[PDB]
């Protein structure tokens, strides 16, 4: 769809970094003269749409956890959990949440979303102890360990993170009957932006 990619170009979601991390070769289009890796932007749309289908397949929204670690991703994750019916963390992760059944915040889910696997290493480590299908949002250098579905973007720009969460939420709403297609979502970006 044309306007989604237009908005993606408005933000800097198509520029990554160095450190190709060979398992992410198939998502990178070219390397520029300054060393920056350019992401395809056509596989991003398809992977986002598949991620939305997988998310909506889950019977209740309460069995979905979205996790963010850095300050410039808390607003987006909170609002995304608000419009859907999922749970968000957005802060300091307690090292034994998913595996210690006596702790006060056990909260065992069925599906888990990560803003960045490099900074959210503790949460993705604990997912392999309880059969949880991690879905991530990966840059050109992200490790793809214990990651099932990867969406290629840049995890650094605040506007990029806001735009990706906005797109994913809009597509999830389309996949339900809350609003039919052919008219855009009335809420606007800058709801998901930081400060």
């Amino acid at each position: 769809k044309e306007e989604s990619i237009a908005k993606m170009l408005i933000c800097k979601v198509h520029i990554g970094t160095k450190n190709l991390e060979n398992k992410m070769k198939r998502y990178v289009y070219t390397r520029a003269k300054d060393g920056v890796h350019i992401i395809n932007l056509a596989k991003t749309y398809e992977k986002l749409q598949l991620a939305a289908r997988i998310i909506v397949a889950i019977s209740n929204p309460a069995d979905v956890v979205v996790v963010s670690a850095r300050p410039f991703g808390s607003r987006a994750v909170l609002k995304f959990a608000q419009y859907t019916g999922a749970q968000a963390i957005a802060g300091r992760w307690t090292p034994g949440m998913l595996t210690n059944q006596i702790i006060q915040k056990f909260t065992e889910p069925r599906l888990l979303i990560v803003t960045d696997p490099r900074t959210d290493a503790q949460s993705v480590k604990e997912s392999a102890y309880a059969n949880i299908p991690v879905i991530a949002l990966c840059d050109s250098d992200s490790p793809l360990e214990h990651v099932d579905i990867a969406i290629p973007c840049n995890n650094k720009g605040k506007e990029s993170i806001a735009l990706m969460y906005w797109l994913l939420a809009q597509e999830v709403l389309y996949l339900k009957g809350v609003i039919p297609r052919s008219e855009p979502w009335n809420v606007m970006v800058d709801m998901f932006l930081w400060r």
């Binding site: 170009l9 520029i15 289009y29 520029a32 350019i38 395809n40 056509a42 970006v189 800058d190 709801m191």
Partner: protein, 118 residues
């Protein structure tokens, strides 16, 4: 030294959370309120608890204090940060792209009418 053990601090924090609308910035009134609310066998520990309550109440005026969940502040900050801008910055007339980005987009076969490099 005059460091306060965890019993004193925990009691003071709960007192602040549960009875915020009554409390003030004056030690004597807060001493009376703490006499009435809680259960403390010794007047010395009661004085110390009331002193920490007053000290905590002073800090709240300057902004957020970590570990004390006061709802009024929370809805105030939520309604502050939920400001809807009248114009979105997402939409602009012209997109500026790299030469390689433009070549990529042209290669993928998607059409955008307002793309301009440099």
């Amino acid at each position: 030294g005059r460091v306060r053990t965890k019993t004193i601090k925990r009691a003071a924090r709960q007192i602040v959370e549960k009875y915020y609308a009554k409390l003030t910035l004056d030690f004597q009134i807060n001493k009376k309120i703490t006499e009435e609310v809680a259960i403390i066998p010794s007047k010395r520990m009661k004085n110390k608890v009331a002193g920490f309550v007053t000290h905590l109440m002073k800090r709240i005026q300057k902004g957020p204090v970590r570990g004390i969940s006061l709802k009024l502040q929370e809805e105030e900050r939520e309604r502050r940060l939920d400001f809807v801008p009248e114009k979105s910055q997402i939409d602009v007339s012209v997109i500026y792209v790299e030469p390689d980005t433009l070549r990529m987009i042209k290669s993928l076969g998607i059409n955008i009418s307002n793309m301009k490099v440099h």
